[PDB]
């Protein structure tokens, strides 16, 4: 009656992008960004991994709200050090380690029965 | 009604186990433990599932419209 | 490899119980979460009820027929069908498959998911085919007719995310345990008297050494070793869960960094 | 339009200025059919 | 004009489906019909448990 449509979990709505980049007041060189149609399932990886980051200062992530699927990252970065590049790092890593694991998975799985 | 499709909880098909509950039943005289075991129902959200589970449709089909 | 270890203790065609081995415990989270929701299957999506005198409602069948398994291999070259240039629903999109039963016997008529018949175009991909891992070969017992009792439906199964509809949901219960010997303490056991003796041993701590007693606590230790369990429906083999997962995972990872490509245009 | 009786398997037609009873039966109960424009369902 | 509207609306909060549609004469011979609406209802948020 009043419940939202389930897409609007992942579907982007109108004029909604994935990524919103606001420059932080707070600390200098710090960023927060909005990420659209995305849970903790992106959230808590991409943060854990801007953590493995030696040049990464501070790292968090937080869903204001359970009802609407979208979630803010605090990143800042040290100076000499776009925190935009950190997040790219992070993602590539992130890949990175899935390709691995995923190529991992599959020849440990024909070297299996039943 | 009639034996829930999947559980609710985890989301194992059982819908298709109904039948072969109440004959692990009847023809191997089999206790419900056991019964529920053989179906490859271990974890006990399924085992309730299928277990908690009374067919009603059973009766309503004694109607005759 | 290089990366993140893999040790298939287990496999069949509907468990795998492996080891994430030089993994992060956010990543493992996050691949359990993506085999969890994000996963594509194929699904009744639609119905359309011509005759229905049996005893259950129209939309009860219809959601019994929602939560059936179907055969979701190449489900990669279909389509959503918001993402379809066609009218509603085509071939490429969406698989239409009917259902026509009656009493027939006097006894009562069973409708099973076998009864289902693909009506659209498969074109070669692997789709729709309602899974039966049933012994006899029925498959999910969606519903029961009398003696005069008819149920004429047809069906369009629509690609779908768990994440919209727990009907899409290509996974059972993913098993989940790290640290069985708790030496990273992120669980303060509850007890009576003996702490040990009244929680069961877990079966992983077969897979790990035991701590000493004259050793202190290792607070830099992290957690590495993950033992999982994937169970599947049907809709999707195992490997092909964990797999795709991954890949999806990997896949919604890459969006993210090709957003941060598309935010330099000025 | 067309009805259908209770407690009987009948197809009466009688429109208006008829109504009860049935045909070959007896009983006044008589139910509307089902219509003829399908309608569809979300299996969700 | 030569008639006064005397119809039954669909209740204004609710929805449904026309399950089952009822036509019987009275007892004084007065023809008089129950209509019965399906809706169902998936739990909500504020729903009573
Ligand atoms: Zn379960
Ligand atoms: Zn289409
Ligand atoms: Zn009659």
């Given at each position: 009656?009043?419940?939202?449509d389930?897409?609007?979990?992942?579907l982007?709505?109108?004029?909604?992008?994935?990524?919103?980049?606001?420059?932080?007041?707070?600390?200098?060189?710090?960023?927060?960004?909005?990420?659209?149609?995305?849970?903790?399932?992106?959230?808590?990886?991409?943060?854990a991994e801007?953590?493995?980051?030696?040049?990464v200062?501070?790292?968090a992530?937080k869903?204001?709200?359970?009802f609407?699927?979208?979630?803010k990252?605090?990143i800042?970065?040290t100076?000499?050090?776009?925190?935009?590049?950190?997040?790219?790092?992070?993602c590539?890593?992130?890949?990175?380690?899935?390709?691995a694991?995923?190529?991992?998975?599959?020849?440990?799985?024909?070297?299996?029965?039943? | 009604?009639?034996?829930?499709?999947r559980?609710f909880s985890?989301?194992?098909?059982?819908?298709?186990?109904?039948?072969?509950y109440?004959?692990?039943?009847?023809e191997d005289?089999?206790?419900?433990?056991?019964?529920?075991?053989?179906?490859?129902?271990?974890?006990?959200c399924?085992?309730?599932?299928?277990?908690?589970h009374?067919?009603?449709?059973?009766?309503?089909?004694?109607?005759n419209? | 490899?290089?990366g993140?270890?893999?040790?298939?203790?287990?496999?069949?065609?509907?468990?795998?119980?492996?080891?994430?081995?030089?993994?992060?415990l956010?990543m493992?989270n996050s691949?359990?979460?993506?085999?969890?929701?994000?996963?594509?299957?194929?699904?009744?999506?639609?119905?359309?009820?011509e005759?229905?005198?049996?005893?259950?409602?129209?939309?009860?069948?219809?959601?019994?027929?929602?939560?059936?398994?179907?055969?979701?291999?190449?489900?990669?070259?279909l389509?959503?069908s918001r993402?379809?240039?066609?009218?509603?629903?085509?071939?490429?999109?969406?698989?239409?498959?009917?259902?026509?039963?009656?009493?027939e016997?006097?006894?009562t008529?069973?409708?099973?998911?076998?009864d289902?018949?693909?009506?659209?175009?498969?074109?070669?991909?692997?789709?729709?085919?309602?899974?039966?891992?049933?012994?006899?070969?029925?498959?999910?017992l969606i519903?029961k007719?009398?003696?005069?009792?008819?149920?004429k439906?047809?069906?369009?199964?629509?690609?779908?995310?768990?994440?919209?509809?727990?009907k899409?949901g290509?996974?059972?219960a993913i098993?989940?345990?790290?640290?069985?010997?708790?030496?990273?303490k992120?669980?303060?056991?509850?007890?009576?008297?003996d702490?040990?003796?009244?929680?069961?041993?877990?079966?992983?701590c077969?897979?790990?050494?035991?701590?000493n007693?004259?050793?202190?606590?290792?607070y830099?230790?992290?957690?590495?070793?993950?033992?999982?369990?994937?169970?599947?429906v049907?809709?999707?083999?195992?490997?092909?869960?964990?797999?795709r997962?991954?890949?999806?995972?990997?896949?919604?990872?890459?969006?993210?960094?090709?957003?941060?490509?598309?935010?330099?245009?000025? | 339009?067309?009805?259908?009786?209770?407690?009987?398997?009948?197809?009466?037609?009688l429109?208006?200025?008829?109504?009860?009873?049935?045909?070959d039966?007896?009983?006044?109960?008589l139910?509307?059919?089902?219509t003829?424009?399908?309608?569809?369902?979300?299996?969700? | 004009?030569?008639?006064?509207?005397?119809?039954?609306?669909?209740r204004?909060?609710?929805?449904?489906?026309?399950?089952?549609?009822?036509?019987?004469?009275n007892?004084?011979?007065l023809?008089?019909?129950?209509?019965?609406?399906?809706?169902?209802?998936?739990?909500?948020?504020?729903d009573?448990?």
């Amino acid at each position: 009656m009043n419940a939202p449509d389930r897409f609007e979990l992942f579907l982007l709505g109108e004029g909604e992008s994935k990524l919103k980049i606001d420059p932080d007041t707070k600390a200098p060189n710090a960023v927060v960004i909005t990420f659209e149609k995305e849970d903790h399932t992106l959230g808590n990886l991409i943060r854990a991994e801007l953590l493995n980051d030696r040049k990464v200062l501070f790292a968090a992530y937080k869903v204001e709200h359970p009802f609407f699927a979208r979630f803010k990252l605090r990143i800042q970065t040290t100076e000499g050090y776009d925190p935009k590049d950190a997040l790219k790092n992070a993602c590539n890593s992130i890949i990175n380690k899935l390709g691995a694991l995923k190529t991992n998975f599959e020849t440990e799985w024909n070297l299996q029965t039943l | 009604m009639i034996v829930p499709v999947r559980c609710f909880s985890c989301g194992k098909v059982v819908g298709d186990k109904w039948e072969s509950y109440l004959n692990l039943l009847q023809e191997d005289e089999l206790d419900e433990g056991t019964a529920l075991s053989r179906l490859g129902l271990k974890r006990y959200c399924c085992r309730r599932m299928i277990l908690t589970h009374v067919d009603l449709i059973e009766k309503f089909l004694r109607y005759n419209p | 490899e290089e990366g993140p270890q893999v040790k298939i203790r287990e496999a069949s065609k509907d468990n795998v119980d492996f080891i994430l081995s030089n993994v992060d415990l956010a990543m493992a989270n996050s691949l359990r979460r993506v085999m969890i929701a994000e996963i594509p299957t194929l699904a009744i999506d639609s119905v359309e009820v011509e005759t229905n005198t049996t005893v259950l409602a129209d939309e009860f069948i219809a959601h019994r027929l929602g939560l059936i398994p179907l055969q979701s291999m190449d489900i990669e070259q279909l389509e959503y069908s918001r993402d379809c240039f066609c009218e509603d629903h085509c071939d490429k999109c969406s698989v239409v498959l009917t259902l026509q039963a009656f009493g027939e016997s006097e006894s009562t008529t069973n409708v099973y998911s076998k009864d289902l018949v693909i009506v659209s175009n498969l074109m070669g991909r692997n789709i729709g085919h309602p899974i039966i891992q049933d012994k006899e070969g029925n498959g999910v017992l969606i519903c029961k007719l009398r003696k005069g009792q008819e149920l004429k439906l047809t069906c369009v199964a629509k690609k779908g995310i768990a994440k919209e509809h727990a009907k899409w949901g290509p996974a059972a219960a993913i098993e989940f345990e790290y640290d069985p010997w708790n030496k990273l303490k992120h669980t303060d056991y509850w007890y009576e008297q003996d702490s040990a003796k009244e929680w069961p041993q877990s079966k992983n701590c077969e897979y790990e050494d035991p701590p000493n007693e004259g050793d202190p606590f290792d607070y830099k230790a992290q957690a590495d070793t993950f033992y999982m369990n994937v169970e599947s429906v049907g809709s999707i083999p195992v490997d092909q869960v964990v797999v795709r997962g991954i890949d999806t995972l990997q896949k919604k990872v890459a969006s993210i960094l090709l957003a941060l490509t598309q935010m330099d245009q000025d | 339009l067309k009805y259908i009786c209770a407690e009987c398997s009948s197809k009466l037609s009688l429109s208006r200025t008829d109504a009860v009873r049935c045909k070959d039966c007896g009983h006044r109960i008589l139910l509307k059919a089902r219509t003829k424009r399908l309608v569809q369902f979300e299996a969700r | 004009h030569s008639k006064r509207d005397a119809s039954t609306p669909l209740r204004s909060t609710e929805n449904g489906i026309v399950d089952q549609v009822l036509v019987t004469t009275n007892q004084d011979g007065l023809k008089f019909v129950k209509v019965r609406v399906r809706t169902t209802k998936i739990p909500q948020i504020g729903d009573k448990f």
